Amino acid sequence: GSRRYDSRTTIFSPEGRLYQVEYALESISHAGTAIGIMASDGIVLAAERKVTSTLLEQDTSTEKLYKLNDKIAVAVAGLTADAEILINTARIHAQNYLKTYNEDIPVEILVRRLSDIKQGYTQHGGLRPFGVSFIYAGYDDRYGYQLYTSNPSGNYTGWKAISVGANTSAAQTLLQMDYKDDMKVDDAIELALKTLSKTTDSSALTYDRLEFATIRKGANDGEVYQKIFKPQEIKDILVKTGIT
Amino acid sequence: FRNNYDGDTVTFSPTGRLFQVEYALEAIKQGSVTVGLRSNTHAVLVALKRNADELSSYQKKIIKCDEHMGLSLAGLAPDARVLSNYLRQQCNYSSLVFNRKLAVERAGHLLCDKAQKNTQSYGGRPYGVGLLIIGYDKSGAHLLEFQPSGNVTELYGTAIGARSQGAKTYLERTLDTFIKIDGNPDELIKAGVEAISQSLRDESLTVDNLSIAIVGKDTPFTIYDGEAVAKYI
Amino acid sequence: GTGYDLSNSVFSPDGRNFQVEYAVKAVENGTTSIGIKCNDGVVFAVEKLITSKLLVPQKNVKIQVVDRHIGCVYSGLIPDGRHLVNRGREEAASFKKLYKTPIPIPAFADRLGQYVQAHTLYNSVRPFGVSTIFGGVDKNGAHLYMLEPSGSYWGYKGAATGKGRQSAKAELEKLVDHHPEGLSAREAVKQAAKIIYLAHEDNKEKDFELEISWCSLSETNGLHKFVKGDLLQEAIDFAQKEIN
Amino acid sequence: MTDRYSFSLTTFSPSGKLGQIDYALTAVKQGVTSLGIKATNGVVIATEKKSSSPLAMSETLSKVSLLTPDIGAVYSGMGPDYRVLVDKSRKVAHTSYKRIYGEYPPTKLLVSEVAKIMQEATQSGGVRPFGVSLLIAGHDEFNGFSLYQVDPSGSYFPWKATAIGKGSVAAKTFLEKRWNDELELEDAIHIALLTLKESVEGEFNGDTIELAIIGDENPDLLGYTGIPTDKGPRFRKLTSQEINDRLEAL
Amino acid sequence: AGYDRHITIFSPEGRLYQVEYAFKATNQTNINSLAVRGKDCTVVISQKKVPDKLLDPTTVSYIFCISRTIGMVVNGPIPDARNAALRAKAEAAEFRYKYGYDMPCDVLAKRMANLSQIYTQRAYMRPLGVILTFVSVDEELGPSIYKTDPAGYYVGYKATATGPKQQEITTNLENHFKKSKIDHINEESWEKVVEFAITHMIDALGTEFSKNDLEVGVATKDKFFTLSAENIEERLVAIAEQD
Amino acid sequence: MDIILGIRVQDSVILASSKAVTRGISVLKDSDDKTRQLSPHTLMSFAGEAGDTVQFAEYIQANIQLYSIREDYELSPQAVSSFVRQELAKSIRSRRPYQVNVLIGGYDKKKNKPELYQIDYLGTKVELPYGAHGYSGFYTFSLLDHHYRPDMTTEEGLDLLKLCVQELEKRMPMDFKGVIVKIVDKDGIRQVDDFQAQ
Amino acid sequence: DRGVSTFSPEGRLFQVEYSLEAIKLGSTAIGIATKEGVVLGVEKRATSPLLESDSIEKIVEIDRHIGCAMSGLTADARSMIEHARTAAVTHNLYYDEDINVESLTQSVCDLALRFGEGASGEERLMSRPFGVALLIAGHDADDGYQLFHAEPSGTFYRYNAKAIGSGSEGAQAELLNEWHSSLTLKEAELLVLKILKQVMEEKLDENNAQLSCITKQDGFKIYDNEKTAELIKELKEKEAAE
Amino acid sequence: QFNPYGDNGGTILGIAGEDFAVLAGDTRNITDYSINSRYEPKVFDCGDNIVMSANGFAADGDALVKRFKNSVKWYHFDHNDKKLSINSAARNIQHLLYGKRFFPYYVHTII
Amino acid sequence: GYDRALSIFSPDGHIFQVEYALEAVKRGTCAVGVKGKNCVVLGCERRSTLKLQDTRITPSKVSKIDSHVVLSFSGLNADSRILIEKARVEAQSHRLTLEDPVTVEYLTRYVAGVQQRYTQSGGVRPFGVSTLIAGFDPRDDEPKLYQTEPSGIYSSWSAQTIGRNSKTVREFLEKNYDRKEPPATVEECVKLTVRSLLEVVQTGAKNIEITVVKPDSDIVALSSEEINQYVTQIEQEKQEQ
Question: Which terminal residue of chain F, N or C, has fewer Cβ atoms less than 10 Å from its own Cβ?
């Protein structure tokens, strides 16, 4: 029958590791680097697009940064197709929660659910895992600003600053070096760009190769605001920090 | 070579053999010996029971299917429990719906068809048991032999199990004698016990060792064990 | 690397299904059976190997009836043949239930043909280990068919399969030449005994039991009926006489 | 009988490669060159009709297809896979959008649905990925004109101009030198023909080249008059004769 | 490194070997077929080989009557051929019931090519080892020839040929359409179109034919039918008088 | 029928519930507690069909308690009431709808404000200064329209309750055997034992 | 790989045979049947001294007249016990009587071969056989005091005495010589303790070994440690005497 | 509209002594005002020295007897030919009867 | 539709998939449980590989199942969330039908049963998780501590450890825990827990987290400052002798 062709995606190695989770994690280590930094007055999400092209439209494009809620957003590393499947269910979950409780979903609850869907493809069903690592950026009235990460294993953790994708080891060492607790958003924007610039496999870090977003509390509004940086705005902030 | 074609029942060998079926047939040959034989009036099962220790009971080889039909087993006993249970329901259905005692010929057809479906489906194994079915219906005394391949044969007499070739030669040589034992149950049991001892080599057939069953014209299917078989020793 | 023969639905590099070819091998190992189409009906005969004197004569019937007008005989794995007839029986009852009329033979042939072909489409099933010779009488003429493990079938003037198929065919071809306008039902039964006795040289080490059936417009009223007693003994003597 | 392939047929290798997706892209590389160029007031998509026999009627095989009155597709790779994808894409435009909103899905959203169907063939039990890369050209009221590429993995990217298939490496270089953000649609068609001339060794005319546009509304293509808010489809396939006109001055 | 050739999944080269091996299966019968279009008809020719003298010749056929207007010739083994036939017959009846008009030649072709594509993508189904040629006179498109393979590919034809010796018939026809300039057979009656097809079968294969060596199917306005041995026999006398 | 009353004052919500359980011609019990604590600062009173009444309340109680453990956090009175409504709103178009009317009385520790929610069996929710289910409303609503002030103390709320109960004991046809009174505030939920003989 | 319910060339089910090797690694269990009752004893075998021994539950009650001792992968026994209890209680509900020990054992054994990936006849959800053997002891009005050895193969034998686990063959050779039809209950208790003492790695005491009996009068009881301790003390006095 | 029940009349009677019991019943079977049969046995021997009758709607009565008799048969098959005691038969019948609590057998039954 | 048997017997009698699930547990961070006379203490270590974490929001290793019972684990974190969730539902279900909170033994037996079920079901792998379950039965003042593992086996312990280097800490507890006189105080029991982890963790100021569970639903987690004070005292003991 079919038994001859089954890869057995959900079995342990003699060492106690899950083959497909390990191999999917190896896939992500090749994907464009994404960086999240949490500050006292907001959160930064930065991501490096891959390779690029002259004709590749940057205006309509948004491949690595996604809006999940009015208060939650994600940076993606890995297969975009796999990510969009998980992104949609997360979008539905936040709306189900809002319909039930008349309150916006707390950030951890949303993360835990997605991290549970991923865990499933790890344990039953005989399908391959999602080749995706997420960085979650959010706000709620319980824990305020929050930064989480999740990977194909279904494991999630909380962070002050974190990186996913390529060269995370080199990126984490640099963040571990320059990050402090009483940081401001505008300082965090700088750290994110400097880190990406130092870990790039490309020549010069340019605007057409970056996606940038902030979750800041309105400097006069009092409400929480999401800002996906438009091509021209990143071009500006790249001269600010001093990379031209 | 062979290791490639014995993985499942779904696979044919290059010469056209079904090894999983053939391996199931081996469970029968490893099983304890049992014999069946008939005349025109009666049909008789004789079985040698096997134990594990001198502290264990002897495992039963004969199972009642209805008031007019039963069988003896050789091989996997749980499989025989499955197949005897099925034959109990089929006998039960025929009575409740048609008020009819199930014919021993279609009794064998139902067993054949049920075993066949396991030899063609993926994931299923073949049954690992041989069966000797005796009966008395509207056409007199009947004896059947069942193989896990699905093949079922009507016979005057036969034997299955270990060393069963000894008994089968005896019955083949004494055919004309026992076929005429009409109206005498005891002289048919005699011809059955003498047949089974032709297959003994190690032990002597004893009081808790021997198992006998009978069915016929004015005899419902009844099992004889223990001290009830002592007179045939 | 090869192993194209290990799974059913698989094509070999030369376009073959090796599992079907291996099923054919089980048929050739089986007992010989035949079919002879006459001027208004059909005659079926089969060899029955007497392994032991312990086998009750006239009791292990191999020829089967579908409906009231069709006869079936097969060589190879018997249980498979029994399975196929149970299907033939269901398929015919269904046809009668809807269309009132008893199933025409060409219609019945295709029903078995589509069923056997289905068992060569999936690796989760094993091909049928039988060639089936069958036919009967419908609203226009008499029909004879042979169905292969592949699902292939054609109409025949005469059909043979099993152990002595070569001997039978050679004999059947001489009948087609000597009787161009047709053979009678009485004559076909007698001649069917002759073919089986001549084909038995392939298993000449063991004794055998003859079994004949016929379905003829004027001889059986277009119904399937077994040949018994006087007519059978007449056919047996005809074969016994024409052997020296 | 029943399907026992409930497990993935595309899995991760030790290196992180998704083998079946990588191979599917190889099949797309073997396929005939198709392309797409986006102008200020329209989008052009073009491919070569590679005929399997001169006895075949290439008119009966459309490599360029309408998905909605304002959205069209073209491909490189395996023809049959494309055909079934077009069917599903047309259906999903109704089931997931038009039957809900009473209008056709915007270009990006239909692309997203097409990508989802292709992603599923990457993860679901008992299937291989689709052996095609699509180019989808479209217009919608709020986004203007757009061009997207959809890969076997289910990934999609927006393009100013691109090519896929055989000579896509040389074609992309040819398009880089010629594209600007001030192009009129008539210009884009001219470039499309020139780019495709470097791919085709054989005959080069309206009978061997398939070309379609996403441009102005075509009221003469609507089929009816009456409703003023309906002005006709923006998808138009150029005729054999209409192509030959632009080849006389080329 | 091995099992990419046993089920319908991609090889490193981007190939589906099971589909390629299914094409090999279509030639197993060693039979050639051709199809041409007339003014208002379509003709299929297929070789009839009956080697065994025990066979009934009338039951040996690779041309099927799918519906009142559509006919189909198969190149490939008969079990797969009959599988395809029955499905086509079933799909044709269903179309007429659901949509209120007879299924067009090209539409049925697309439908069968779609089913063939599915076996090319799903693992538990094997492709069928057959090439299907559909012919009709469509009430819109006129005389039609549409052919589908195990790859799920399908296209319309001016004329076509299928089988082991396909290339001989193909180039022979191509040369005729280069000579004539028009993309059909300029003849009013189907009887003379059948003669053309047989003549160009002989001139391409290099072999003569008797009434039992051929199998002919004809499609006219609102009718597809198959010629008896005698109708072919009449058609074989007509060619002998001209040459 | 069963008496179910709620009143929200300055810094607490008061719930009063009748003690009688009557079936047919007999009063089976005169000390029934028609309430469940959903969380430390949230209380629900209930009245309706015989079986449905308690079965629904305990179901809601289990879910909220499950939420609390999962999140190590307490849902706001608003969030609990939205949850209850949706359960009843699902219920009416099911095979056999829950026939239960509820009052949710909570103290929102985040907003520092008492909150009272009236939800009927159809899933009709509304936030109110004071509320009642069944026929009780036909007397108490107009009385509270007159005497209620939004800045009343918990003790003033209790006197106002006594006035509602004295009126229901005078005019309602059935003997509901008095009420059990509970106070929900910033310190949790407590029971007033001396109400029946104040 | 190779299917779960596949026959060996010798005519055996691979999975059943391997399951039998898992039982040989389990702790020793001993059953002795007499005319005064049936005695069941087990080796506790704690992995660490920190492990609280009286939580090792290798002797369980199925009904008032049926008890059970287990050996092998003991976690596999839960669902077998659960089935057994339900069968016993359900029988009393349909028939207002006690289930026969033989019927109860047969019921447990009907589950054993319900493994595989799709056996024709009945849909059976279980990926592998049980990796545990059972000793089922009880009493009924028809056949009296009984002892059954229930295997993962589906077969069950009746025994006068039986030992299962890591010391099973050495204990069985010993039980062969010691068992007679006139054994008293007190002799049977001391006999279980004697054989356990022999096959165990550790020195036997009331904490690392447990006793139980089933009698018609008092039903099925598990002995408290103080009772067993006194029987161990009594046994050492007898061995020393001769 | 279709009525699934009917009334076949008849009366049954059971009395127990010290070492014996009797179960009697008239042999008349009726529909409305017509007689169907003057002799239609209504009390049955069921094996294991149990006699049974289910009076009322005969189709339901014959169903139950048939179903119980089959229960006795399977009891022997399942429990080593054990005799079914009268109290066990009684409890088993309760489960047969209550098994159709929402589409009952219209019978008064005595064993 | 996927029911492939993944947990199966090997020729010598092992279920390799269950055996490999234990290896995942051996890789997980260390977890320890010790019961005093009137309390149970759960200790856990935290990884030092990456330490730019947000400790406020990061899932803690000790989870409350009900107001009176806690569960800690060693192994695959993602797997544990499934077990914890199921245990929390059974706790609420038990209260609903029995009108009484779960006993610690009951909850343990439930979790163990879930774990076992995944070792003989089609199309599932075993849980790569061993748990320590601790608490006090309703109205009861006797401490309870249980351990489960991938096979579904469970038992109660005076003291137990699971996870990486559990061999070393078990060695420590075996010669430092006296069943005769257990830790009489909460202060005593906490100290012994930290001592055991200090063999494995190597200077764990924040890398050690302690949770104390007392009778009648009194569960409290210890802060960094409080734990650090035990660490400070213990290290001073060595240099005196």
Answer: C
- In terms of CATH architecture, what is I1-241? 4-Layer Sandwich (3.60)
Give me the phi and psi of B210, to 5 degrees please. -95, 140
Within 2-31 of A, beta carbons closer than 8 Å to E belong to 2, 4-5
Give the CATH number of the domain where residue D21 resides. Answer: 3.60.20.10
Q: Which helix or strand (DSSP H or E) is residue I189 part of?
A: helix I186-197
Rounded to 5°, the CA angle I102-I103-I109 comes to 90
Which residues form the domain of D203? 1-250
* DSSP secondary structure code for residue D98 in this structure: I
DSSP-based three-state secondary structure for I147 = strand
> Any CB–CB contact under 8 A between I196 and chain G?
no
d(CA B196, CA B174): 13
Report how far residue A139's alpha carbon sits from residue A127's, in angstroms, rounded to the nearest whole number.
Answer: 34
Show the domains of chain A with their CATH numbers. Answer: 1-244 (3.60.20.10)
Find the domain containing F67 and state its range. 1-198
Return the CATH number at F13.
3.60.20.10
CATH superfamily of G1-242: Aminohydrolase, N-terminal nucleophile (Ntn) domain (3.60.20.10)
| Residue span of the structural domain in which E53 resides | 1-243
> What is the dihedral angle through the alpha carbons of E183, E188, E192, E197, rounded to the nearest 10 degrees?
20
Domain locations in chain B as residue ranges: 1-233
Q: How many CB atoms lie within 10 A of CB F115?
A: 21
Q: How many domains does chain E have?
A: 1
Single-letter code of the amino acid located at E160: T
Give the integer Cα–Cα distance in Å for E205 and B172. 66
Cross-chain residue pair A101–F71, CB shorter than 8 Å = no
d(CA G90, CA A114): 44
Residue of F nearest to A104 (CA): F79
Considering only the beta carbons, identify the residue of H79, H91, H95 that sits closest to G103: H79
Overall number of domains in chain D: 1
CB contact under 8 A, I95 and F70: no
Judge whether F116 and F104 are in contact, CB under 8 Å.
yes
- Cα–Cα distances in Å, from B29 out to B161, B165, G130, H42? 5, 10, 27, 53
E193, E185 contact by CB (below 8 A):
yes
Q: Which stretches does DSSP call E strand in D122-208?
A: 132-140, 144-150, 156-158, 161-164
* Chains C and B make contact, 3+ CB pairs within 8 Å: yes
Contact G55 I158 (CB under 8 A): no
B26 to chain G, closest Cα gap in Å: 5
Strand-pair partners of E148? E132, E154
Does G15 contact I at CB distance below 8 Å? yes
Kindly indicate whether the domain formed by C1-244 is annotated with CATH number 3.30.365.10: no
The first and second tokens of residue G221, run together, are 């009881």
CA–CA separation, I20 and A17 (whole Å):
8
Resolution (A): 2.8
Q: Which chains touch B (3 or more CB pairs under 8 A)?
A: A, C, G, H
Residue D30 C-alpha from the chain's centroid: 17
Chain G partners of A3 at a C-beta cutoff of 8 Å? 1, 3
For residues I212 and I220, give the distance between their C-alpha atoms in angstroms, rounded to a whole number.
6
CATH number of the domain at B1-233, out of 3.40.50.1970, 3.60.20.10, 3.30.70.260, 3.60.15.10? 3.60.20.10
Number of domains in chain F: 1
CB-facing half-sphere around the CA of E230: CA atoms within 13 A = 0
Distance from CA of I7 to the nearest CA of D (A): 17
**Residue C179: C-alpha distances to residues C144, C182, E51 (Å):** 17, 5, 20
Neighbours of chain C (3+ CB pairs under 8 A): A, B, D, E
Method used for this model? X-ray
Catalytic residue at C220?
Answer: no
